[PDB]
Every structure is written in C-alpha cells, then in structure tokens.
Amino acid sequence: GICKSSDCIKSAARLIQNMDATTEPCTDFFKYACGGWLKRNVIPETSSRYGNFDILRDELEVVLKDVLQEPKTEDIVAVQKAKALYRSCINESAIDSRGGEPLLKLLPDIYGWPVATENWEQKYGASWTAEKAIAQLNSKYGKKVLINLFVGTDDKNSVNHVIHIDQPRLGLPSRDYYECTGIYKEACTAYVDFMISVARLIRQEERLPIDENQLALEMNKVMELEKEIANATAKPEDRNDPMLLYNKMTLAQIQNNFSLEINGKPFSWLNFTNEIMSTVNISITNEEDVVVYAPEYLTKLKPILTKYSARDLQNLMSWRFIMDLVSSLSRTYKESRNAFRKALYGTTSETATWRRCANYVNGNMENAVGRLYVEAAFAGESKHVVEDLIAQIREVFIQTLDDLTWMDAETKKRAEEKALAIKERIGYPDDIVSNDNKLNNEYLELNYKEDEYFENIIQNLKFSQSKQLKKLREKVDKDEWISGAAVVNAFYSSGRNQIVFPAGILQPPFFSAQQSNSLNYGGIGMVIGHEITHGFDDNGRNFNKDGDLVDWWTQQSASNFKEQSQCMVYQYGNFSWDLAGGQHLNGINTLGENIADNGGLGQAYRAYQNYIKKNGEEKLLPGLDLNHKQLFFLNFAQVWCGTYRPEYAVNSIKTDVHSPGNFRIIGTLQNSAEFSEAFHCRKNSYMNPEKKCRVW
Numbered sequence: 001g002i003c004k005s006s007d008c009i010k011s012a013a014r015l016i017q018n019m020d021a022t023t024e025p026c027t028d029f030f031k032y033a034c035g036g037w038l039k040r041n042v043i044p045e046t047s048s049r050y051g052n053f054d055i056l057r058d059e060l061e062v063v064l065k066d067v068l069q070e071p072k073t074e075d076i077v078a079v080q081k082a083k084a085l086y087r088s089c090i091n092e093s094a095i096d097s098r099g100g101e102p103l104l105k106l107l108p109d110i111y112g113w114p115v116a117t118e119n120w121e122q123k124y125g126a127s128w129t130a131e132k133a134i135a136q137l138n139s140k141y142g143k144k145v146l147i148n149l150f151v152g153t154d155d156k157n158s159v160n161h162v163i164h165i166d167q168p169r170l171g172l173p174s175r176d177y178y179e180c181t182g183i184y185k186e187a188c189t190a191y192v193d194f195m196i197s198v199a200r201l202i203r204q205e206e207r208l209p210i211d212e213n214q215l216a217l218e219m220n221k222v223m224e225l226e227k228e229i230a231n232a233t234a235k236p237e238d239r240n241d242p243m244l245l246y247n248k249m250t251l252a253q254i255q256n257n258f259s260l261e262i263n264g265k266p267f268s269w270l271n272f273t274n275e276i277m278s279t280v281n282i283s284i285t286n287e288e289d290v291v292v293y294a295p296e297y298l299t300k301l302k303p304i305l306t307k308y309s310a311r312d313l314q315n316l317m318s319w320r321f322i323m324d325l326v327s328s329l330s331r332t333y334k335e336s337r338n339a340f341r342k343a344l345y346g347t348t349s350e351t352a353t354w355r356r357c358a359n360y361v362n363g364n365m366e367n368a369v370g371r372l373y374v375e376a377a378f379a380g381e382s383k384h385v386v387e388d389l390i391a392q393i394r395e396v397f398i399q400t401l402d403d404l405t406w407m408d409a410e411t412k413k414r415a416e417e418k419a420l421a422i423k424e425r426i427g428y429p430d431d432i433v434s435n436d437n438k439l440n441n442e443y444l445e446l447n448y449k450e451d452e453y454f455e456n457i458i459q460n461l462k463f464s465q466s467k468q469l470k471k472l473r474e475k476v477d478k479d480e481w482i483s484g485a486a487v488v489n490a491f492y493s494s495g496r497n498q499i500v501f502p503a504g505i506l507q508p509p510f511f512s513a514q515q516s517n518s519l520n521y522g523g524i525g526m527v528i529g530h531e532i533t534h535g536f537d538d539n540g541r542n543f544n545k546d547g548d549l550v551d552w553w554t555q556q557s558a559s560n561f562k563e564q565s566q567c568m569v570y571q572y573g574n575f576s577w578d579l580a581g582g583q584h585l586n587g588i589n590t591l592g593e594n595i596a597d598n599g600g601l602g603q604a605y606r607a608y609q610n611y612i613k614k615n616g617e618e619k620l621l622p623g624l625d626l627n628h629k630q631l632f633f634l635n636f637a638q639v640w641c642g643t644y645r646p647e648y649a650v651n652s653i654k655t656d657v658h659s660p661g662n663f664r665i666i667g668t669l670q671n672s673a674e675f676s677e678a679f680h681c682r683k684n685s686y687m688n689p690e691k692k693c694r695v696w
C-alpha cells in the first residue's frame with residue numbers, strides 16, 4: 001500500500017539519496033537528512049555556497065537560457081528588447097573591443113576620478129560640490145555614497161511615498177571588515193590593492209605616467225576615509241526596531257540639527273535634495289517632510305568630512321561607482337577583481353557569462369522575463385492548489401493564537417486583524433501573459449544597441465533610479481509585485497501586508513501537484529508560514545493591517561514578545577560555526593528569520609495534521625522505512641542541505657539575516673515537539689533539549 005507512482009518513485013530516490021541511513025536523527029538531524037548530499041558533492045569553483053537551494057537557482061538559469069537566446073519572429077516588442085539585452089550581454093569580443101573607453105566616457109560626468117587625473121583640482125574642483133557630486137551619482141546612476149538619500153513607501157502612511165536619508169552602504173561586506181585584521185586582513189589588503197589595479201589600468205589607458213607609490217598613497221587614504229565612515233555607521237543591532245529608526249523631519253530641522261561643512265561649504269540639504277529630484281523637475285522646499293534613519297550617522301560625519309579635501313572624497317565616491325562598473329568591461333578590467341572576490345567569496349573563477357547575463361536581464365526586465373519562464377516552465381493550476389494551501393495555513397495561524405498564552409486578548413484579536421488581511425501573490429501577474437501593451441509599455445523608454453552592453457548597463461541604471469525618483473508624489477501602486485516571477489524565493493512585505501510566492505519556488509521540492517502532501521506541507525507549506533509569520537516577527541509585529549507603523553500591542557504583550565523571542569536570541573547565539581572559524585552566529589541580526597522558521601514549520605505541521613483528520617493517511621513511498629509524519633520533516637530538512645566556503649561564512653555570519661541552513665534546521669527542530677515525537681527522541685537528546693523557545 002506503498003504508492004509506486006513515477007512521481008512517487010521519483011521523490012523516494014531524491015530523499016534517500018540525500019539522507020545518510022546511519023546517523024541518529026535525534027543526535028544531528030542535518031547529517032541525518034543531508035549526510036550523503038555532503039559526501040558526494042563539492043563546492044564548485046564559482047560558488048561561495050552550494051546546496052539544493054542553490055542548485056534550484058542554477059536550474060532556473062538554464063531555462064532562462066532556453067528561453068532568452070532564440071529569436072522568435074512573433075515575439076512582441078517587449079521580449080525583443082530583453083533578448084537584444086541578453087545577446088548584447090554575452091558578446092565578449094565586442095565588450096573587449098572596447099577596452100575601458102565606456103567609463104572614460106563617464107568619469108567626467110561624475111566630476112572625475114582624481115587618482116587618474118592630470119591636475120584634478122583644476123579640471124573639476126572649482127565646480128565640484130557635495131550636493132551635485134553626490135547628487136549626480138545618486139540621480140543618474142543611483143549609486144548612493146556618503147549620504148544615502150532615497151525614495152520609499154512611507155512607514156506611517158503606506159499609500160504614500162517619501163524621501164529618506166540614511167547612512168551609505170560600504171565597499172566591503174560589512175562594517176566589521178574595516179577592522180582590517182585577522183580574518184579580515186586579506187579582504188582589506190585586496191580591496192585597496194583593487195582600488196589600485198583599477199586606477200592603474202585607467203591611467204595606462206590614458207597614456208599617463210604611473211607613480212605606484214602615490215597610488216599606494218591615494219588609495220590608502222580612501223580606505224582611511226571609509227574606515228571612519230564605517231565606524232560612524234550604526235550596527236545592525238540598533239537599526240532593527242522601526243520605531244527608533246523612524247524619525248520624520250523637514251529639510252528644515254534637518255538643515256538645523258545635522259549641518260555639514262564639506263570642502264568648507266557648508267552643506268545645503270535643500271540644494272542637494274533639489275539637485276537630485278529635479279531629475280524629474282519635481283520641486284522641493286525647506287518644509288519637505290523627511291524620514292531620517294541615521295540621525296547619529298550624520299551627527300558623526302561632520303567631524304569626519306570636516307577634515308577631508310574635495311579630492312579626498314571624490315576618490316572614494318567615484319571609486320565606489322567604478323567598482324561595480326568594472327565587470328561590465330574587458331577581461332583586462334574584470335581580471336582586476338579576482339583577489340577581491342576570492343577574499344570575499346572564496347571563489348577562484350567567475351560563473352558562466354550566459355549565467356551572469358541571464359540574471360542581469362531577469363533582474364532588469366523581470367516582468368518580461370517573468371513571462372517567458374512561466375510559458376517554458378510553470379504549470380498554472382498550480383496557482384490554485386497553492387492558494388488553498390495558503391488558505392489552510394492562514395486559518396491554522398488563526399487557530400493558534402487562542403492557544404498562545406503569552407498574549408492578552410485585545411492583542412490576540414487585532415493580530416487576527418492582520419490575519420485575514422494578509423493578501424497573497426502566487427506565480428505571476430496574469431498581467432504579463434495577457435496584456436502586451438502594458439508590457440511593451442513599461443519598457444518603452446528602453447532601447448538597446450547590441451554592440452553597446454555598457455551603454456545599456458548605463459541606461460538600465462538611469463532607468464530605474466528615475467523610475468524610482470518618479471514616485472515621491474504618487475500613490476503606491478496597489479497592483480505592483482515585489483518579485484519577478486522569475487525567482488526562487490518567497491517574500492513578505494510590511495507596507496503591503498503581502499505574502500509573495502514566485503513561480504520560482506512553486507516547484508519541487510517545496511511543491512508539486514503530484515508528490516505526497518507530507519512534503520508539500522513540509523516544503524512550500526512551511527514556506528508559506530515563513531512569510532505570514534513575518535507578519536509578526538520583531539519587525540512586522542509593529543505593522544498594522546495596512547502597512548502602517550502603528551502600535552497595536554498591549555504594553556504587557558510587548559514585553560512578553562521580547563520576553564519569548566529573547567529566548568531564540570540566546571539559542572542561535574550559542575551556535576558556533578566551524579566553517580566560520582567557530583565564530584558565534586549573531587542571534588539578534590537573525591531573530592526575525594529564526595522566529596519565522598519556527599512559526600512557519602509548526603504552522604504547517606498543524607495544517608498537515610488537519611489533513612490527516614479530514615482526508616486520512618496516504619500511501620507510503622518505496623525505499624524508505626519512515627512514515628509521512630517524518631517525511632514531513634525530511635523534506636523540510638532537505639531544503640537546506642549544503643555547505644559554505646570559509647570566506648563567505650565569515651561574510652554570511654555578518655551579512656545574512658538568515659541563519660545558515662544547518663542551524664535553521666537544528667535550532668528549529670530543537671524547538672519542535674512535533675519533531676522529537678516523530679523521531680522518538682530521548683529527552684535531552686541534542687535535538688531534544690528540555691528548554692524550548694517558542695513564540696508563534
């Protein structure tokens with residue numbers, strides 16, 4: 001009474017083949033579940049991580065390849081551009097032809113790159129300002145440096161867009177690096193070595209003279225600059241409550257409270273806000289409201305920027321644009337950048353060009369690429385089994401608050417309010433098959449010249465930024481998606497109160513109409529509750545049914561949340577990670593995603609038990625002496641099989657907001673009664689510790 005279905009027979013052979021028979025589930029369930037995935041496999045030289053999740057992404061790229069690279073005489077204008085785009089992106093001979101010339105075409109737009117100019121001060125430095133310089137970067141090229149000023153959905157009013165000012169992202173992976181010793185020594189050496197390599201070609205190309213000692217010199221100053229800017233930046237720990245973060249202001253007080261003297265100006269926020277947004281000649285006066293995320297970062301910069309030349313700063317800011325552009329040029333430039341990605345990512349090669357390239361248009365043209373993937377790739381009724389599945393997991397989420405003892409029932413009950421108010425997204429806008437015009441229409445400012453990859457790169461940039469600036473005074477498009485379809489993840493938004501499940505996940509092992517439902521709830525199921533639960537993690541707990549940051553928690557129900565979730569803080573926090581040299585995870589930077597793992601799994605078990613009840617138990621699959629109940633957990637586990645190169649683990653541990661997969665599993669399993677019951681685990685089995693963290 002085993003099913004012998006091919007689509008049964010198929011799953012069996014995937015499961016056993018990843019599992020190692022010969023470990024105790026209750027001693028290390030990762031090895032249980034993943035032990036023979038590990039044995040057989042080795043990280044590829046272009047990976048920093050590898051594993052099932054990744055291999056799914058790798059298989060998205062083939063299909064994108066199957067579906068970008070062959071002209072179709074009936075393609076509509078919108079398809080035709082991506083493909084142009086794509087074809088343009090894979091023509092190396094052409095990109096090499098052109099050596100460096102394409103930024104040289106640029107430098108002068110961005111007031112140049114001092115360390116590769118003759119007599120900089122006199123070519124640009126008369127003119128240079130802060131506001132335009134920084135503002136040009138932002139506005140054309142939407143690289144944000146020194147002072148990050150953007151437009152986003154407003155956290156108090158989520159029909160409404162507004163302008164934010166924040167600290168800058170940085171050259172290295174996180175502020176920790178700029179310590180620049182021990183396990184960041186290399187990366188640091190390689191980052192300025194890179195500034196160097198690149199400043200050097202640039203000049204070569206200029207037929208200028210190389211003073212390697214003065215390069216060593218300029219480029220190391222630049223480093224000292226970002227170091228100081230790094231130290232001024234706020235930790236992720238203190239950014240992680242959106243009530244302390246959200247401080248709303250007019251350029252007015254802003255101009256008053258956070259003044260800045262750059263070059264000896266001093267700095268004019270109304271200048272530089274206008275010298276950006278008048279890139280759709282939108283109009284900005286000293287009573288503009290403005291959300292400031294990094295009050296202190298700007299308190300802190302005056303003292304810094306005080307001591308730097310106009311030239312000091314543009315070498316940094318210009319070298320932070322030029323960084324990224326570099327892989328859009330000839331081998332000789334790309335080369336520049338080996339040691340710096342081995343130092344960061346551990347890889348000894350780049351990934352296949354068709355790959356990087358598929359991914360670029362997918363990212364730049366998501367809707368249009370969206371379309372092609374679904375036609376190739378994704379089955380469509382799908383959309384309908386999911387929704388119900390989602391139904392299911394919704395209720396169970398409703399089910400459960402009654403049963404949670406740490407809340408009071410005013411709060412229990414609003415929570416309900418977000419509940420049914422969650423809007424779901426599955427697969428893709430029917431839009432994007434249905435409606436050629438809109439499609440052609442959203443790309444219509446686009447035109448791509450197949451011998452012009454840079455030029456398109458550069459278009460596409462100026463696109464999206466102006467696409468973004470466009471937005472100050474418009475209402476949030478209710479209709480818009482946060483994922484391309486094209487993608488193997490799923491999401492939750494606060495603005496939107498929305499859960500998103502791209503066709504890209506809508507596929508094995510998380511879901512097929514056809515495998516057993518055990519693995520469906522094990523899989524997409526736990527994923528649906530992952531997103532919903534983000535609902536209420538330490539971030540989205542502060543957001544109401546409409547996107548809006550407004551406090552709907554009983555005083556004491558708050559203190560209780562913290563009280564419960566503090567437990568996870570401490571659990572995952574004492575996880576130490578060999579691949580990262582034994583370093584401890586960061587249990588705060590991970591609370592959200594840990595919290596929502598644990599919610600979602602249980603959420604989903606319950607959904608599956610219920611399926612028990614009303615549908616009755618289902619035929620077993622060959623090969624495996626386990627029951628469905630455990631298979632549930634099996635699939636959950638196997639989602640996250642794989643491993644990590646050392647360099648990127650260091651990096652991950654400071655820059656990811658997930659836990660690594662092996663602890664997404666053990667932390668969460670360590671916390672699952674349904675678990676250690678399934679697998680009949682002695683008390684204080686390592687997978688079965690008495691203390692068990694719970695919140696949702």
Ligand SMILES: CCCCC[C@@H](S)C(=O)N[C@@H](Cc1ccccc1)C(=O)N[C@@H](C)C(=O)O
Pocket residue numbers: 053489490491492526527530531534593639658
């Ligand atoms: C910042 C990028 C990630 C955004 C989505 C967050 S809520 C998340 O946790 N997504 C889940 C999706 C998921 C859930 C359960 C199981 C598998 C996948 C996630 O873990 N994404 C991983 C793959 C990631 O984005 O790094």
Ligand SMILES: *[C@@H]1O[C@H](CO)[C@@H](O)[C@H](O)[C@H]1NC(C)=O
Pocket residue numbers: 087091093094451
């Ligand atoms: C690459 O571009 C070059 C030079 O512009 C051109 O000769 C060639 O046809 C292109 N290759 C392909 C197949 O796109």
Ligand SMILES: *[C@@H]1O[C@H](CO)[C@@H](O)[C@H](O)[C@H]1NC(C)=O
Pocket residue numbers: 129131268270271272274275278
């Ligand atoms: C901003 O002011 C600068 C000098 O502060 C000036 O040169 C520039 O044109 C101004 N731009 C706008 C839009 O006010």
Ligand SMILES: *[C@@H]1O[C@H](CO)[C@@H](O)[C@H](O)[C@H]1NC(C)=O
Pocket residue numbers: 569570571573574584
């Ligand atoms: C380790 O977890 C324990 C359990 O309480 C906690 O007390 C301690 O703070 C944790 N250590 C770390 C690194 O936070």
Ligand SMILES: [Zn+2]
Pocket residue numbers: 530531534593596
């Ligand atoms: Zn998540």
